[PDB]
Amino acid sequence: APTKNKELLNWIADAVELFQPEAVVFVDGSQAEWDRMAEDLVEAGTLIKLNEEKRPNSYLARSNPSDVARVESRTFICSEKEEDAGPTNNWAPPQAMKDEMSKHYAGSMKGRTMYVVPFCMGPISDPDPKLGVQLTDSEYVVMSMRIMTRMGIEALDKIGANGSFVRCLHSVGAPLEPGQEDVAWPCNDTKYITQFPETKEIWSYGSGYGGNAILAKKCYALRIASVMAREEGWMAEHMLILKLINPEGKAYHIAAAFPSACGKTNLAMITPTIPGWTAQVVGDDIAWLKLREDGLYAVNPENGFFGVAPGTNYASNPIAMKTMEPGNTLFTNVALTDDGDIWWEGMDGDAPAHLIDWMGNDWTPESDENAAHPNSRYCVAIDQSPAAAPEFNDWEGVKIDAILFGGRRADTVPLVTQTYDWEHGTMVGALLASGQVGTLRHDPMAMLPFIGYNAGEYLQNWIDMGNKGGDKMPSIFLVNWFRRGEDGRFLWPGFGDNSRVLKWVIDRIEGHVGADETVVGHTAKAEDLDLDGLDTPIEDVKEALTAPAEQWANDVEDNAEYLTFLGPRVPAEVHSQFDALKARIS
Amino acid sequence: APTKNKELLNWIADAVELFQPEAVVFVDGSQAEWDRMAEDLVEAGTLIKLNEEKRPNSYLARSNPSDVARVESRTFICSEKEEDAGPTNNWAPPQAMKDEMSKHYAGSMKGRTMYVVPFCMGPISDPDPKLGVQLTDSEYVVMSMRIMTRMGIEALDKIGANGSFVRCLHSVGAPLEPGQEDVAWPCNDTKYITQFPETKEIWSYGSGYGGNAILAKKCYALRIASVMAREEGWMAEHMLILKLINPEGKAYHIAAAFPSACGKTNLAMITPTIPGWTAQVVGDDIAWLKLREDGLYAVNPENGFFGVAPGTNYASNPIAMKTMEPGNTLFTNVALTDDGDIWWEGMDGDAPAHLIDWMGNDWTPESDENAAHPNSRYCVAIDQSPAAAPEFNDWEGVKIDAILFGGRRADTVPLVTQTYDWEHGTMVGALLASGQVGTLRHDPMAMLPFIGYNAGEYLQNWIDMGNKGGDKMPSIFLVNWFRRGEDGRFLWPGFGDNSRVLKWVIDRIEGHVGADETVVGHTAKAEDLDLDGLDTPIEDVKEALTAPAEQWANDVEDNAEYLTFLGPRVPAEVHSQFDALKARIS
């Protein structure tokens, strides 16, 4: 118990009375502490240690099939007023959810140890950092947390004697009776994930899996962080931060908000396919931004990658594969090979003829069920990446030069377009969606499941920042890599070739321009685009660059409905940008 | 007061105390009473009377854009235990919910009349009817209840001095101070629809619209009613009920669950396309089924049609159109002509030069915005249909001979296929999906927003029903009108011609047609369909009746995760049928 913080300890003190753990242990975040936990969990059944000359210090977790992601219907924003959760959030009364949850918490830790996990959400050298503590009965969550945050003694020292912190409560809801044998993956048929914005608490129950259990991941870094960003004057976002360095060696940084699971990751870790361009990753998931006075700066509140495994391979993400090469990775619900290595769908070979699947069953390729679950994950530290940006651990943040929004659309949305200004940009984000009334799948800012308050106010935060902020805001772009030919073929190759789209972007914000105007905005002229090496020469699918106004007309009503959906706090400014859009298509 | 019902009188006393209405008015059901409310609402500027020479005794309601459907975000099944609400429902603790809502209900009828709306769910001739009473401050709700239910003094006399009922409370949430002028459409930015299954009560707040306010439709008819069904050994389902009479003689009755409204509307009021088959509607929305002596029998609990107006014309649904040609229709959020008739998109009456849209603005066929909102409705008496089955008012119901499940699938699912037995049919409904990986859009039983308790336990109800009924159970079929060729066009003309399919379901029941074995079950051989006339499909028909096993093997992981998602009350019977399906798929 290395702390003199009276709040910390009383809170811990009430938790122990309720939860009733067998013992309590402050986590220090040490390598011995990790080793000790690996071996406890290898002895439990929970982790399988991977072949050491394949993948050192690397483990596979298989979860109970019903505890493998998500649980939206039981994830609540418990603000005091229903209207501060808003239409995009679940809500239920804050005290009665506390009462509901203690009924479940009472005794939940009996037969188990309660770990006290201090943590900090960005570089420890920031003079004034966001901080939390999690109480959990899961050594798995303690290990994942070691990779995903700055955990342990340094962060208990940052909280200090009088510092504050987000308080996180977590139990997998599987108390043991004396002399009672346990399971590999403990969990409950009742699962709750509850955020309480006013008080900055996060309380989870019944789930040992990813985001429900690693309360740092979405609950903190997006849902609660977003409220702090609202209350304080900054932005917590679902952005990748990428750094792009040209042949001249100039550095530029690009924030991008994509719904795509690993759409984000394959650009966050891109290898440019154009000579002289390299890129480094600052984060692939979450971006906290504030206004310094000479620009918008982003930090990554995370310390690790927690990426979707399927589809990851040396053609599509060699940087993610080169990161897991030294080992030191927690894999969850991926397959196991006869070599004691791991596999998943989309890997560079032919499917192996035998595996053990994420369920523990012999598997052959003629199974129609997947060897690795669709939501399966790797969890590895960011600084293990060969393309890890040297300034990813530095509190100053990186200056953002451009923000991208995109979704998958088969039609309508050009490959790349430059917005007019932030307010225009805020509207285009609000309408962000995927697909081809009711048919478009809407994901405003790629934040839909993660806004921790009223989504229309969240768009007013955007408007506020651009004004507060003025001519120092970076330009917003709209991309889309998924246009399809009348045939049905993808028009733009994607993958490492999107670097050509990112150069175009860099070439606009400086002014070596070329845009010919569309309803959507300032869009690539399509031979201001570095297209050397592509499909087969003479090329020029400029079809990916159309925004045919009939297509835009088709969308007008759905978009009109959605903005109404978003409610009474949708800013006057977003509605006006939307008028203008309709004036423009008309 | 016309009632000696003391439970009932207490309950009104209590709501009156809470709500503080200026006046309490028991509603009789009469025509003069309706007339007098339409006059009040025409004065309140709430409704517009249509051209009497064109649409007798009909009205246009226009709602505030802010309450135009929806509020699934705030629709709660408040069981004491959260898993009684289960993974397809929103949950919040009962008592906590009564207090939140009483905080809003407190004084909301200030300046307004509380209407007491006694009502009957189904034929009024039934010796033990499901009855209800709704308290509301909206005369548009009362008007709508008179089309949609058997309402008024008859219903209050059936309740009697000692009758039970469902207690349904409703306020729009717009109380009026001494000075204060009213608005044409009152409501509140805070909206709630809470079902309490144990106590059989429904509370609504903040919305005057559709199924937020009309508590019979949806809240009582499906949600509360499925709870009752599960407790009492019957079924409440989201099925049309169609009478089909074959050439010289025989009457069949087909129930059909489609996730639509107009997919169902178009089948319930189908006019056949084959010589000597005639079709009559018993219902187009909700079915209450109960095993009798020789089979499973269905009542339409509803008294009125409440269908989506756009898309409705004399080519797609002329029975819909002829039901309305006499007038007595209450329209909501359709468009309004310059001489006082209505219009909506998909009307045969192509491009009027000018309309007023459902928002009060002038509309041209240049606007990119719909004149009729897409969820726009007409409400009209079943009685008035030229195609109405005389027996829709029988308390003993119609015997069901086949049940159809259908979703909108461009590929995979054959045009029509017969399931093996009730327990198989049950798995086929569990997996019912559309789209129109993780990309299927599931709707088990076309029930997903409506199940009033644990979804897997609802599957368990189908199973238990199959077991009570044994061989008296109707054959289940899976249809798919929406299959597409290599060029993106439909293989099946549908609309009137789905009668050709309906005839094969009938031939198949009676055993006069064979079947190609697919992975799905017994699918129609093309050569066993038609009747000629088909208007131009070649055996494109054959393509639509295809069940390619690669597309099926593709969906296996999807469907497997979905049965997992539905939880630990998913019957073993359903899992066993899915194993059998995976078996056939290899």
UniProtKB/Swiss-Prot annotation, chains A, B:
Kindly indicate whether the keyword Lyase belongs to this entry: yes
EC number(s) given by UniProt: 4.1.1.32
Matching entries from InterPro entries are given as: PEP_carboxykin_GTP_CS, PEP_carboxykinase_C, PEP_carboxykinase_GTP, PEP_carboxykinase_GTP_C, PEP_carboxykinase_GTP_N, PEP_carboxykinase_N
Residues bound to GTP: A261, C262, G263, K264, T265, N266, R377, R408, F495, G496, D497, N498
Q: Which cofactor does it need?
A: Mn(2+)
Phenotype upon gene inactivation:
Cells lacking this gene lead to the absence of PEP carboxykinase activity and the inability to grow on acetate or lactate.
Q: Provide the alphabetized UniProt keywords.
A: Cytoplasm, Decarboxylase, Gluconeogenesis, GTP-binding, Lyase, Manganese, Metal-binding, Nucleotide-binding
UniProt-recorded name of the protein: Phosphoenolpyruvate carboxykinase [GTP]
Organism in which the protein naturally occurs: Corynebacterium glutamicum (strain ATCC 13032 / DSM 20300 / JCM 1318 / BCRC 11384 / CCUG 27702 / LMG 3730 / NBRC 12168 / NCIMB 10025 / NRRL B-2784 / 534)
